[PDB]
Amino acid sequence: SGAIYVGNYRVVNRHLATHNDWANLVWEDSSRDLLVSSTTAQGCDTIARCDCQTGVYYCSSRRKHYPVSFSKPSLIFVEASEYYPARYQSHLMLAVGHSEPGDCGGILRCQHGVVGIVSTGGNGLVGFADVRDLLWLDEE
Numbered sequence: 001s002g003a004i005y006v007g008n009y010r011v012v013n014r015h016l017a018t019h020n021d022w023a024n025l026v027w028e029d030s031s032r033d034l035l036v037s038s039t040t041a042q043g044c045d046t047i048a049r050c051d052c053q054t055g056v057y058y059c060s061s062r063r064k065h066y067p068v069s070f071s072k073p074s075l076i077f078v079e080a081s082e083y084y085p086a087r088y089q090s091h092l093m094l095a096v097g098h099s100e101p102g103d104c105g106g107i108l109r110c111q112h113g114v115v116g117i118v119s120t121g122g123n124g125l126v127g128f129a130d131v132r133d134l135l136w137l138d139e140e
């Protein structure tokens with residue numbers, strides 16, 4: 001579990017979104033595993049606007065933050081799971097690191113702010129859904 005809170009927006013994994021998020025939906029994309037809803041209170045996270053490929057992510061299944069190198073956002077085949085059939089997921093970045101399904105939502109951050117959230121993984125890899133291209137999260 002986990003979410004990003006920026007301005008009047010809440011960013012979560014689409015597969016973990018609540019009734020309130022769908023009722024207050026701003027934007028969602030199944031192919032990205034992302035959902036953005038509106039909030040009443042202002043959030044304090046800053047979204048990174050950069051091309052960093054190194055950062056730190058939180059891994060709940062180890063209660064640890066790991067420094068990682070990660071690939072650029074791309075279209076990657078993701079195996080079937082409880083929440084999606086086997087499909088290509090877009091804007092996904094991979095790293096060598098530990099992850100389990102319940103680690104989704106863990107933040108990946110660089111020196112500029114939040115880069116994305118854990119979304120995929122398996123066999124010593126961890127995948128993060130990028131949020132750096134969603135420029136509108138910084139305004140309105």
Ligand SMILES: Cn1nc(CN2C[C@@H](C(N)=O)CCC2=O)c2ccccc21
Nearest residue numbers: 033078081083099100101119120121122
């Ligand atoms: C973080 N993560 N995730 C999954 C599977 N998965 C993919 C997710 C997706 N984005 O398509 C949907 C939820 C889910 O359970 C997984 C398996 C094994 C290890 C680490 C893992």
Ligand SMILES: [Zn+2]
Nearest residue numbers: 050052110112
């Ligand atoms: Zn950065």
